[PDB]
Amino acid sequence: HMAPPTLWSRVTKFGSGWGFWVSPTVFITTTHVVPTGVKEFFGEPLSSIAIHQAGEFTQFRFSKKMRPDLTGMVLEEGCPEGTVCSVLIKRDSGELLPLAVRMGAIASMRIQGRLVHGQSGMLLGTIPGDCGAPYVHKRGNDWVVCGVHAAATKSGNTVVCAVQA
Numbered sequence: 001h002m003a004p005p006t007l008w009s010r011v012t013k014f015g016s017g018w019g020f021w022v023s024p025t026v027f028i029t030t031t032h033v034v035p036t037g038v039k040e041f042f043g044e045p046l047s048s049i050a051i052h053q054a055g056e057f058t059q060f061r062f063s064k065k066m067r068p069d070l071t072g073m074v075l076e077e078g079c080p081e082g083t084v085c086s087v088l089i090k091r092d093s094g095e096l097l098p099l100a101v102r103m104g105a106i107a108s109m110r111i112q113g114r115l116v117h118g119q120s121g122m123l124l125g126t127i128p129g130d131c132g133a134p135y136v137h138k139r140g141n142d143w144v145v146c147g148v149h150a151a152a153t154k155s156g157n158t159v160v161c162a163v164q165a
């Protein structure tokens with residue numbers, strides 16, 4: 001299953017990483033990539049945005065249609081345990097690098113002194129700059145998003161995505 005162009009067009013450069021347009025008004029990203037000390041995102045003043053943050057998961061709901069070209073898609077509260085998802089990585093060069101990952105359990109991982117709520121997976125590598133890339137899978141004719149990239153071990157074999165749950 002290959003992600004189509006419109007789906008890749010949801011993956012958006014943002015701060016020190018990326019985020020993802022779930023719908024014309026809803027954008028998700030990883031909390032630690034969000035720019036600090038700004039007055040606006042995508043030209044919209046912060047006061048016109050509903051910003052929800054839960055650990056490493058951040059969701060923006062804009063007051064105007066920012067991507068009216070897109071259909072809403074489903075955001076799951078986490079990825080299906082045991083399923084192979086795809087991480088839709090865009091590199092700064094523009095290279096597309098979809099990575100297959102078998103998802104594990106939602107848990108708290110010890111990461112750089114913090115206890116980070118998220119979901120682990122095993123790569124079937126990610127690098128600095130990739131955080132915020134979406135974890136997706138295809139259910140029938142339709143793609144679903146279930147998390148955003150947050151961390152990986154030195155070997156790259158274990159990844160962690162932030163989840164809404």
Ligand SMILES: *[C@@H](O)[C@H](CC1=CC=NC1=O)NC(=O)[C@H](CC1CCCCC1)NC(=O)OCc1cccc(Cl)c1
Pocket residue numbers: 017032033056109110111112114116126127128129130131132150151152153154158159160
């Ligand atoms: C994107 O910012 C990034 C991705 C990354 C670096 C190396 N391989 C990758 O996929 N994330 C980090 O650098 C991440 C940042 C922390 C910040 C505090 C909140 C949690 C995320 N840290 C990271 O990947 O550290 C390495 C690590 C250590 C222990 C366990 C794990 Cl899963 C990762």
